[PDB]
Design an enzyme around this catalytic site. Structure first.
Site, PDB file in Angstrom:
ATOM      1  CG  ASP A 173      -4.851   1.971  -2.453  1.00  0.00           C
ATOM      2  OD1 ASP A 173      -3.806   1.958  -2.996  1.00  0.00           O
ATOM      3  OD2 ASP A 173      -6.082   2.608  -2.405  1.00  0.00           O
ATOM      4  CB  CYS A 223       7.590   3.454  -0.798  1.00  0.00           C
ATOM      5  SG  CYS A 223       8.179   3.391   0.706  1.00  0.00           S
ATOM      6  NE  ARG A 279       3.382   0.116  -0.190  1.00  0.00           N
ATOM      7  CZ  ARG A 279       2.239   0.569  -0.967  1.00  0.00           C
ATOM      8  NH1 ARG A 279       2.499   1.118  -2.205  1.00  0.00           N
ATOM      9  NH2 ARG A 279       1.091   0.822  -0.361  1.00  0.00           N
ATOM     10  CB  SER A 280      11.853   1.516   0.722  1.00  0.00           C
ATOM     11  OG  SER A 280      11.345   2.347  -0.266  1.00  0.00           O
ATOM     12  CD  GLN A 331       6.125   2.699   6.843  1.00  0.00           C
ATOM     13  OE1 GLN A 331       5.622   2.398   5.823  1.00  0.00           O
ATOM     14  NE2 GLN A 331       5.603   4.197   7.364  1.00  0.00           N
TER      15      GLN A 331
END
Ligand SMILES: Cn1[nH]c(=O)cc1Nc1ccccc1
Ligand SMILES: Cn1[nH]c(=O)cc1Nc1ccccc1
Length: 282
Positions: free
Chosen positions: A181, A215, A221-222, A262
Site C-alpha cells: 500500500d 494501475c 507502477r505501470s 511517480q
C-alpha cells in the site's frame, strides 16, 4: 556511466531526489486538449493525469472517441505498450472496447481494487464462471474461463465476445497482487518473476496488438513495468549492454505519456529491477 555503479554512487551520495527532479525538469510537455474537454470530465480519474493528444488511443466511435490511455511505441526495442488508468464505473465498457479494437492478447494489472481503504479501480472482470458480465454501451460480453492464484500474482483466462459479430477471443489477465500500500517492494524478485510470466505467455510479442497495462493512474507502477521490460530487451539486443541508459529510456517513454515513475523510490526500484534481471537472463 554504467548502471550498477551509478546505482551505488547515488546510494552513497543520497541524491535520488535530485536525479528524479532532473528527469521531471527535462520531460516533454505536449498538449492534452481532448482530455480536458468538459464532456470528458467523468472519463478521467485524476485531473492532473491526462494522455497527450498525439499518442492517445482513439475508440472506434463517432460520438465520443476518448479514453484515458496512451500508446508507448519503443522503436529500437521493437515493443509497444498501451498504458491506461484503472477503469472507472462509467468507463469499463470503453476499456474492453479498446482491448477488442487494438487486438491485445493480455491485460496487466498492478493494483488491488481497494487499497488504503479506498477504491482504486472498478471491479471490471467477473469473479465467477457462471456470472458473466455484459457491457451494453459497447455490446461486449466477458466470461471468466479459469483462474490460477499464486502467492504473488494471479493469472486468469477470459473470453471476450463481440456481440455485434459473435466473434470471440481469449484474453489473459495478469494480476500482480502484492505491491505494498505504501512505498515499493523490498526485493524486485517477485516483480521480475511476474514480468517473465507475462513475456512467456506471448502477450508482449509482435503477433498481437499491444499489451494493456494499468494501475490506478497508469503512470507509476505501470511505468516501472514497461521501463524494466524495455531496458532488459535492449541489453540483450546491443553489442555493449552497459550502454543502456535507464534515464534516457525513461525520458523517451515520457514523450508518449506524462509522469511515468511517480517517486524517487520508484526510480530506485526500477534500477534495482533491471540490475538483478540482467544477471538472471544470462
Ligand atoms: C531479487 N533477486 N536477486 C537475485 O539475485 C535474483 C533475483 N530475482 C529474480 C527473479 C526473477 C528474475 C530475475 C531475478
Ligand atoms: C545483464 N545483461 N542484460 C542483457 O541483456 C545483457 C547483459 N549482460 C551484461 C554484460 C556486461 C555488462 C553488463 C551486462
Amino acid at each position: 556511466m554504467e548502471m550498477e555503479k551509478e546505482f551505488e554512487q547515488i546510494d552513497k551520495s543520497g541524491s535520488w531526489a535530485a536525479i528524479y527532479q532532473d528527469i521531471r525538469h527535462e520531460a516533454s510537455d505536449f498538449p492534452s486538449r481532448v482530455a480536458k474537454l468538459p464532456k470528458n470530465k467523468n472519463r478521467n480519474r485524476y485531473r492532473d493525469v491526462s494522455p497527450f493528444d498525439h499518442s492517445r488511443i482513439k475508440l472506434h466511435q463517432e460520438d465520443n472517441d476518448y479514453i484515458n490511455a496512451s500508446l508507448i511505441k519503443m522503436e529500437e526495442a521493437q515493443r509497444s505498450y498501451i498504458l491506461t488508468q484503472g477503469p472507472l464505473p462509467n468507463t469499463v465498457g470503453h476499456f474492453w472496447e479498446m482491448v477488442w479494437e487494438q487486438k491485445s492478447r493480455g491485460v496487466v494489472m498492478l493494483n488491488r481494487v481497494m487499497e488504503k481503504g479506498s477504491l482504486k479501480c472498478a471491479q471490471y472482470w467477473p469473479q465467477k464462471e457462471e456470472k458473466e458480465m455484459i457491457f451494453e454501451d459497447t455490446n461486449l460480453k466477458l466470461t471468466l474461463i479459469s483462474e490460477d492464484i499464486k502467492s504473488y500474482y494471479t493469472v486468469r483466462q477470459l473470453e471476450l465476445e463481440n456481440l455485434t459479430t459473435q466473434e470471440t477471443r481469449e484474453i489473459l489477465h495478469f494480476h500482480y497482487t502484492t505491491w505494498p500500500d505504501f512505498g515499493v517492494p523490498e526485493s524486485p524478485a517477485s516483480f521480475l518473476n511476474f514480468l517473465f510470466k507475462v513475456r512467456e505467455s506471448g502477450s508482449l510479442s509482435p503477433e498481437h496488438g499491444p499489451v494493456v497495462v494499468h494501475c490506478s493512474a497508469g503512470i507509476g507502477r505501470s511505468g516501472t513495468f514497461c521501463l524494466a521490460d524495455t531496458c532488459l530487451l535492449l541489453m540483450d539486443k546491443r553489442k555493449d549492454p552497459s550502454s543502456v541508459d535507464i534515464k534516457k529510456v525513461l525520458l523517451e517513454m515520457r514523450k508518449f505519456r506524462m509522469g511515468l515513475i511517480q517517486t524517487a523510490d520508484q526510480l530506485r526500484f526500477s534500477y534495482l529491477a533491471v540490475i538483478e534481471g540482467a544477471k538472471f537472463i544470462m
